[PDB]
Amino acid sequence: DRVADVIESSIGDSVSRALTHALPAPTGQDTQVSSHRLDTGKVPALQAA
Amino acid sequence: SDRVAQLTIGNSTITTQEAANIIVGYGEWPSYCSDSDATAVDKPTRPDVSVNRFYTLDTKLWEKSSKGWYWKFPDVLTETGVFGQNAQFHYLYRSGFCIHVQCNASKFHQGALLVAVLPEYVIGTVAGGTGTEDSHPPYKQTQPGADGFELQHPYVLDAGIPISQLTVCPHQWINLRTNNCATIIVPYINALPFDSALNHCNFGLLVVPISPLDYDQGATPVIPITITLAPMCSEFAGLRQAVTQ
Known part of the structure; x- marks a missing residue:
């Protein structure tokens, strides 16, 4: 392999790239203490479906 | 020392000079x-x-x-003050209670009362007198409000159970010879952490004269009985509109 198209090639990569992974979860998630918020720039409610 | 007592909670105070200690129901605060x-x-x-x-x-x-009387809790306080407003504005309710019953007479009067607290005091009917009719008590008898209701068959406690075993519940006596007040403290009793104050009644308070009142003619013939109570560690959750029914 001499030409610098075969050396740099990604052909033959058989490993699957996974964006996510599994985590232990035996019980439901807890709920923590929260207070009031009055700020600009943070909008958890506004979404984009 | 055990005869005189004072109870202070909130902006109200009670003083007594003839008492028989304070009962803490089920040994819990x-x-x-x-x-x-x-x-x-x-x-x-x-x-x-x-x-x-x-x-x-x-x-x-x-x-x-x-014969006797009975009250339902917290049905008595659902129309009185800030407690009533909070109870009818929220969905969930929990609290304890402190109950003080007062009745005084002279040294020539005699009598005795039994003051007991019975959780989940369900009321039955006389089933038409023959056991053939499957009736149910009206809403007036089940939740009489702050006016109370008078027992019809005190021997069976209007529910088919003997009165002679009512001492198994947290209780005191008001013997006109000895004392003139009874104090009981009740924690929150339920199988759930929170519950509705408009659909469920936690317990009931019973005042039944076991030994009849007597006196000679010429003494005062009017012997009143007064009930005083105070919630303890009240909690509310589930804010919404105000519903009364």
Whole structure:
């Protein structure tokens, strides 16, 4: 392999790239203490479906 | 020392000079719900001094031929003050209670009363007198309000159970020879951490004269009975509109 198209090639990569992974979860998630918020720039409610 | 007592909670005070100690029901004090027991996510409200204070409901006259009376909790306080407003504005409710019953006479009168607290005091009917009719008591008898209701068959406690075993419940006596008041402290009793104050009644208060009143002609013939109570460690959650029914 001499030409610098075969050396740099990604052909033959058989490993699957996974964006996510599994985590232990035996019980439901807890709920923590929260207070009031009055700020600009943070909008958890506004979404984009 | 054990005869004189003072009870101070909120902006109200009670003083007595003839007492027979204080009963703490089931050996437990009222307290707030812990994180392990709690299920709802929203934080509750604890108005404190505005709801934990003494309330007096009404005065009932003791006659030579009285049967007895009973009240339902917290149904008595659902229309009285800030406690009533909070109870009818929220969905969930929890609290303890402190009950004080007063009745005084002279040194020439005699009598005796049994003051007991029975959780989940369900009321039955006489089934038409023959056991053939499957009737149910009206809403007036089940939840009489702050005026109470008078027993018809005190021997069976209007529910088919003997009165002679009512001492298994937290109780005191008012013997006109010895004392003139009874104090009982009740924690929150339920199989759930929170419950509705408009659909469920936690317990009931019974006042039954076991030994009849007697006196000679010329003495005062009017012997009243007064009930005073105060919530302890009240909690509310589930804010919404105000519903009364």
